[PDB]
């Protein structure tokens, strides 16, 4: 049978095709995992955003904390200063009467 | 005799099938590269976020010591006021005694 080279060639066409199907299938498997990798890298990111606002909103608090704190401090410093001037003047008048 | 008609017909199908599968593989493969490009993008963007973020936390710490710095100086400022005060009070008590005797 000169059917041998034909036979042999339909053989190879089939092999070719199933090798290609194997390849398609494996590429498709890879995509599905890469696509979850893709997915996860975005979904993790989002969670990260909310960590950021949470933190940046703490920043906001602290600034209005520091400011109020600075302000209390200026107010205390004026008080100390005025109380000490009350002391200086009392000194001053005592040393005067001392001598007239 | 038997034309080869059905044999060459069957061969062309097998070729077509092989061709269809190859198309399939190379689109999937190209698509696989789509995703891996994006992957190589976010992992890098994720890395980016955290550095901005740690620096944001680094800013926030800087604004906690500063708060507590003022807390203390305020403590000092009071002790100072209260001591100055006790002193005028003591001078007052003394003047009163003198004028009384």
Swiss-Prot record, chain B:
Modified residues (N-acetylmethionine): 4
GO biological process assignments: actin filament organization; muscle contraction
GO cellular component: actin cytoskeleton; actin filament; cytoplasm
Residues of the full protein shown: 1 to 98 of 284
Function according to Swiss-Prot or TrEMBL: Binds to actin filaments in muscle and non-muscle cells. Plays a central role, in association with the troponin complex, in the calcium dependent regulation of vertebrate striated muscle contraction. Smooth muscle contraction is regulated by interaction with caldesmon. In non-muscle cells is implicated in stabilizing cytoskeleton actin filaments.
Organism encoding this protein: Gallus gallus (Chicken)
Keyword Calcium carried by entry: no
Listed name of the protein: Tropomyosin beta chain
Stretch list, region Disordered: 25-69
Free-text comment on this protein's domains from its UniProt entry: The molecule is in a coiled coil structure that is formed by 2 polypeptide chains. The sequence exhibits a prominent seven-residues periodicity.
Subunit structure: Homodimer. Heterodimer of an alpha (TPM1, TPM3 or TPM4) and a beta (TPM2) chain.
Composition bias, Basic and acidic residues: 25-43, 54-69
UniProt entry keywords in alphabetical sequence: Acetylation, Actin-binding, Coiled coil, Cytoplasm, Cytoskeleton, Muscle protein
Signal peptide: none
GO molecular function, one term: protein heterodimerization activity
Family: Belongs to the tropomyosin family.
Subcellular location field: Cytoplasm, Cytoskeleton
């Amino acid at each position: 049978a000169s059917m041998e080279a034909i036979k042999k060639k339909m053989q190879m066409l089939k092999l070719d095709k199933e090798n290609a199907i194997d390849r398609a299938e494996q590429a498709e498997a890879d995509k599905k995992q890469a696509e979850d990798r893709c997915k996860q890298l975005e979904e993790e990111q989002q969670g990260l955003q909310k960590k950021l606002k949470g933190t940046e909103d703490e920043v906001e608090k602290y600034s209005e904390s520091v400011k109020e704190a600075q302000e209390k401090l200026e107010q205390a410093e004026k008080k100390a200063t005025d109380a000490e001037a009350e002391v200086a003047s009392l000194n001053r008048r005592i040393q005067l009467v001392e001598e007239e």
